[PDB]
User: What shape does this take?
Amino acid sequence: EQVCDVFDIYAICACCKVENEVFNNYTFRGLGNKGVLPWKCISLDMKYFRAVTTYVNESKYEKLKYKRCKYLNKETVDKLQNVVVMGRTNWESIPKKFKPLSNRINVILSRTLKKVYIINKVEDLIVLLGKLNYYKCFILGGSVVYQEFLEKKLIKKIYFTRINSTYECDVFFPEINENEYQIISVSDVYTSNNTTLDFIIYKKTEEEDDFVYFNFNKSIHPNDFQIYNSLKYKYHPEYQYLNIIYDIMMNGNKQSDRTGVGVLSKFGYIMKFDLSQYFPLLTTKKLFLRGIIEELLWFIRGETNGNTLLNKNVRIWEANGTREFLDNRKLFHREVNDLGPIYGFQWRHFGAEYTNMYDNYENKGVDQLKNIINLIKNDPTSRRILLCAWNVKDLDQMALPPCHILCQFYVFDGKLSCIMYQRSCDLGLGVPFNIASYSIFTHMIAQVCNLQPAQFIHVLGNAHVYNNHIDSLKIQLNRIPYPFPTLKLNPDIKNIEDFTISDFTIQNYVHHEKISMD
Amino acid sequence: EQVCDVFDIYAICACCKVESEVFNNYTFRGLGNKGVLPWKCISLDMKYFRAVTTYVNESKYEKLKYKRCKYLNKLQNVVVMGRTNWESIPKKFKPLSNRINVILSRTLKKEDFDEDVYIINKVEDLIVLLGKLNYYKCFILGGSVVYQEFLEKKLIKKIYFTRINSTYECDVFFPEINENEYQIISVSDVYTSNNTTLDFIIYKKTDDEEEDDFVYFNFNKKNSIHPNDFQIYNSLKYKYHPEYQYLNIIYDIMMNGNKQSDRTGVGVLSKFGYIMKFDLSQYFPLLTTKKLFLRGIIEELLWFIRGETNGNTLLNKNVRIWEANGTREFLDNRKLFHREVNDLGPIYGFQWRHFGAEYTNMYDNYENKGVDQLKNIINLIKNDPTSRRILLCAWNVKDLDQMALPPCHILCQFYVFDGKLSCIMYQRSCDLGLGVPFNIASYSIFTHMIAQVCNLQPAQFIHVLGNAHVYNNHIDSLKIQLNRIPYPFPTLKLNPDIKNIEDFTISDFTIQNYVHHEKISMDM
Ligand SMILES: NC(=O)C1=CN([C@@H]2O[C@H](COP(=O)(O)OP(=O)(O)OC[C@H]3O[C@@H](n4cnc5c(N)ncnc54)[C@H](OP(=O)(O)O)[C@@H]3O)[C@@H](O)[C@H]2O)C=CC1
Ligand SMILES: NC(=O)C1=CN([C@@H]2O[C@H](COP(=O)(O)OP(=O)(O)OC[C@H]3O[C@@H](n4cnc5c(N)ncnc54)[C@H](OP(=O)(O)O)[C@@H]3O)[C@@H](O)[C@H]2O)C=CC1
Ligand SMILES: CCc1nc(N)nc(N)c1OCCCCOc1ccc(-c2ccc(C(=O)O)cc2)cc1
Ligand SMILES: CCc1nc(N)nc(N)c1OCCCCOc1ccc(-c2ccc(C(=O)O)cc2)cc1
Ligand SMILES: O=c1ccn([C@H]2C[C@H](O)[C@@H](COP(=O)(O)O)O2)c(=O)[nH]1
Ligand SMILES: O=c1ccn([C@H]2C[C@H](O)[C@@H](COP(=O)(O)O)O2)c(=O)[nH]1
Assistant: This one.
């Protein structure tokens, strides 16, 4: 029977980053600078902190007192609040207008303070706790306090805010030992005061029956997903991707492939990412975006020339443009790397007769990109703001038919959302890039129409995991996401055709190690 | 305290429809015929009945034992049967296994039974018996005389009620349940077993560390619709009937919808992005919380498949779905000044059979012009079933302004596994109160037709909604409808001799066992 369990002693803290980088939990360590917080107010962390440290559940107290008494070999302890323990320097950095911390029993560790309790050794806290009625006990820091409370093994859980930005710091949270503590929960990702952040939790290592009745009809070893399955709360939006992989692995249909690879597949999924709060660049592996952005730029120019991409070493379309690949598609009369009437051609020239990749198509066919931008600007409540690449007439002349069938747009209260329907979804290699690409695009349309981006919504049709990706995705599922990065566009660009590679910046991308999916 | 609460006395039953139109909960009331059951085995109900009457939770007995102790001062359930019920059970099934069996009788006594059973000769003796036994719950198993007297005396806490959605000859009937004594608290998924659909409803008499963590994670959490406006809807504990996928979306839009104007002038509440899934192997999802007829939508689908764009064809069969979109005034407001009345332009049927052909008029012969995508997808399903390119697309960007209006149903994608066909339809714009009920029915039918002609069985119709809206003028009608409890769905049957997609006619379709609430004008 350990003290921290008896007295419900917990740590709570907020850690920023500090000035081929490798990332780990320790990336998030920064606590303070010059007696104060490294950052200007991050008001969302403040609200979380207040609510965690003040929250009490009276009905649960009877049971805690019991345990505490039986431990201290007593029969009695002799409006419920929590205890909060601050180091002296910590207590001095708090604006006086906020001291003592409201609705909490304030305890201060100090050797040089004299009488809101003061105490001058840790063991004196245990004593004080044995003589109080309190719900739980929260160690609020600073650095010295966490250090000693942690080495003395006095901490049941760590409520750890990850501030995904870099500050100058002079004091650090200690390195949490992964054999001592493991993460059991991860929150939604949020933006506050110009940074992303998330909240994670380390742990020390009648109607009921009716529910059963309604359930009366209901080569992967899930034990391999130890970390995945041991998490309790999985609210980080990256879990929308990871959970689909889990689902396909566990419940997928075995089917054969043109490459003889084999897939597990399922049909019909939705993911939704809130672009006002973050940029959903997967963090459970490394992803690179230069190629993805050039591809989008090449679509917007309405290009179908694969050489343009190849000469910038963007090799996404290379295999689809070879002599052999075109001949197998019966495009015997197509030049190498002429991909035919694919996305760019359909976005700007839908319905025009395709000749070759060098022809001049200006003012030929339907310029649906211009059309949707005008509809957003002039008739935002239109339900016909669609951009469609599936030209049934032209499919057989494409190097391959589009995987990204259409985008539809929705405008409410100055904000833009986008649904993209994908007929075919390689969860392991394709879908991560695909989410990035259409999130970028959503931002680009929003900016040129003076709107703010809201949600990117991804509908997956035939959704598959290649059998040669399974071992890699197993490794990936047992990694814990980090808070997402942010995308910044150059704010000067007000025309969809005016963006260049230099107008795009990913900020604060923290990621696990790259994985060769094969 | 009541006797039924102390001793945990429940009823479980199964009721079919009977021969003798308005529907109500009393539609399901057939129990028995000539001393045995009205149907041959409905095995899924037998499985449910065994699961419910045999399940026990040992960890909860201690509190039960305490409660009954106060009242008076391996674990198993007790089951109680009328004598006629007992004699109806096949010998090999008696006594009911893993249960304490109790029989009510005057004419027979314990010397008349070989089996491990308790005989009781009045209800009062049941209660005495329950006071003497160790048991989890007590299930009253019928028949009609027994249900009658247990209900009359208020000795039933809940009724586990199976709705068998088919009609049989009966001579005995469950009591009419008094809606002021008993109300439905829960409704199951809908299933098919032994060629009938059925569901299961429930009437009621009228480390918690991780719990605090739940609260912490919620530290950061609209429309003047009123709470009491959904009393019945919100009083249900389990809402597992697939009709709730539709009803819950309506609720979501009412409560969280964004207010917006629209091309129509009415304004709406809107949201963006929903998915519904319907299991066509188990039911035909025609909405039951209001009345729908399918003659028109079936004639529409046949007209689509034929490649037709002539609205007169529909009007001549008294189908008016497209009438307003073909008037002189409508076409002119679309700037289609050189279009004949009821010439709807290159819409669905034209795109399905002739995508990319130049549209002239509704009378032209377009044979072998454009892409016959309907044919192409049938060929793909038959010869390349694992293709990820089996898509039928009505949104032809080039032809949009020539259409009476652009399609709402943008595309269907198909999926085949293990001899079974699934279908996703993506709907760019979705009128929840009027359009969507019919849209679900149309694409569900089309999935069955495509499956049959490719020698597959239907699996799931998946409906993806883009712009999803409730018209302000529909809100009061939808409020009414949401306080209705769905009935088990109907089934759809097709003439099995039809083996080509082009060869269906209206009499090739039958909708069987449609039970529904009354018709609702969505508008005033
Ligand atoms: N971001 C976050 O989550 C948090 C950050 N901070 C930041 O951390 C910094 C403060 O950290 P740090 O410098 O380590 O200071 P601390 O808050 O850890 O204070 C240390 C002091 O506490 C007293 N003390 C410590 N251990 C004991 C003990 N065992 N017995 C008795 N008294 C003890 C002593 O005061 P004495 O001199 O009287 O002996 C000691 O010098 C600031 O910059 C602050 O803003 C603060 C709170 C949380
Ligand atoms: N579909 C369903 O869910 C169910 C249907 N059934 C069907 O229902 C029919 C049987 O119903 P029903 O004809 O109403 O008969 P019951 O099963 O209700 O049995 C009636 C007999 O039970 C005895 N009995 C009942 N109440 C008492 C009492 N208070 N004290 C003493 N004895 C009592 C008497 O036996 P005695 O004459 O010997 O004195 C009486 O004649 C059959 O067709 C059966 O298959 C039955 C149960 C479930
Ligand atoms: C960083 C928070 C935090 N977060 C987490 N998760 N764990 C913590 N243990 C933690 O901190 C230590 C708690 C005591 C400090 O209590 C303060 C109160 C108010 C201001 C304050 C400063 C500036 C403004 C303003 O400029 O408006 C307003 C308030 C600072 C500290
Ligand atoms: C309809 C059941 C039922 N359902 C629900 N929901 N509540 C009920 N209270 C209920 O009944 C009460 C059970 C007493 C009769 O228990 C039987 C057991 C087996 C066969 C039996 C007969 C024939 C065959 C065969 O021919 O295959 C197989 C089994 C009949 C009755
Ligand atoms: O942007 C893309 C393009 C392709 N794919 C995957 C889906 C399939 O695995 C393959 C294309 O093969 P077909 O589905 O077209 O046959 O590429 C994606 O995930 N994303
Ligand atoms: O099969 C159909 C046809 C139409 N609509 C509704 C959606 C809109 O309320 C309206 C079409 O208007 P636009 O979205 O095209 O503006 O009709 C449906 O729900 N289903």
Summary: The first helix of chain A runs from residue 3 to 6. The longest strand of chain A covers residues 452-466. Residues 206-236 of chain A form a domain with the Single alpha-helices involved in coiled-coils or other helix-helix interfaces fold (CATH 6.10.250.2210).
